[PDB]
Amino acid sequence: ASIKQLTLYTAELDRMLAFYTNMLGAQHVHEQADAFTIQLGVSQIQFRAAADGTKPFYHIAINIAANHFQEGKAWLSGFGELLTENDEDQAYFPFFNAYSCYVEDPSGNIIELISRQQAAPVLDKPFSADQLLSIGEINITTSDVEQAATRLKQAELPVKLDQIEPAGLNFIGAQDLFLLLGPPGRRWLFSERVAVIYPLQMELDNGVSLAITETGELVILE
Ligand SMILES: [Mn+2]
């Protein structure tokens, strides 16, 4: 499956709108009162105003073509200093056979471009914002990992309950989309920030809709 719509919160609505408009172009953004949406290929993200006293952020990876990694990395570096880990400004993940690069947006969201070497198409054309393919990862940071995994299995997602680690990160998915299911607490790779529970809502290709409440419970909406 793929993510049709992801709803996230932000305490920096105005700066976020300016950042994404400059990055993707007005044609890929739609401003509303107290919220705006951005189009990322077949996926859309709607950023809504956060509650005062909160500064939500998330880890979002965006799929790009198998052959577009260096162009993607160059393009991303135009919007912010590339984040680094172990002093390197990119990573290779053998589990996903993918190359990744990162930048922070105005809210501190960890924005990753992930180029899956065998699980993404080869696009014989120049890379551009119009070549972002879909959302490839989103963190599902929950107060109950076991309960959450059990419910995602119903949402029809591939889940091997016997391998679910309640105190760690769990890669739930296949092909080009993986939900990063885990508890709050640990520092995210490439970031100074640690995983913390913030609300979000997600609508999948299969008509399944879910939400993470402000206390971290994963709930199937439809
Ligand atoms: Mn990632």
Author numbering: 2 to 223
Sentences from the paper on this structure:
An enzyme that showed the ability to degrade toxoflavin in vitro was recently identified from Paenibacillus polymyxa JH2 and was named toxoflavin-degrading enzyme (TxDE). Structural and functional analyses indicate that the enzyme is similar to a dioxygenase in both its structure and function, and that toxoflavin degradation is catalyzed in an oxygen-, DTT-, and Mn(II)-dependent manner. The topology of TxDE is composed mainly of two layers of β-sheets, which bisect the molecule into A- and B-domains, each with seven β-strands. The location of the active site in TxDE was suggested by the presence of a possible metal binding site in the B-domain, consistent with the requirement of a Mn(II) ion for its catalytic activity.
Subsequently, the TxDE(D175A) mutant, which is catalytically active, was crystallized. Its structure was determined in substrate-free form at 1.6 Å and in a binary complex with the substrate toxoflavin at 2.0 Å resolution, by molecular replacement with the refined structure of TxDE(F94S) as a search model. The structural features described in the present study are based on the structural analysis of TxDE(D175A). TxDE encodes 221 residues, but a total of 222 residues from Thr-2 to the extraneous leucine and glutamine at the C-terminus form 14 β-strands and three α-helices in the substrate-free form. The metal binding site is embedded in the hydrophobic cavity in the B-domain, which was generated by a deep, concave, funnel-like surface enclosed by the hydrophobic residues. Although the top and bottom of the funnel are mostly closed off, there is a vent on the side of the funnel that connects the surface of the molecule to the inside of the enzyme. The metal binding site is located at the end of the 9 Å-long hydrophobic channel from the vent. In the metal binding site, three residues from the inner wall of the funnel (His-60 from β5, Glu-113 from β8, and Glu-138 from β9) as well as three well-ordered water molecules coordinate with the bound metal. These six ligands form a coordination shell of octahedral geometry, with an average distance of 2.2 Å to the bound metal. In this coordination shell, His-60 and Glu-138 form part of the equatorial plane with two water molecules, each across from His-60 and Glu-138, respectively, while Glu-113 and a water molecule trans to Glu-113 serve as the axial ligand.
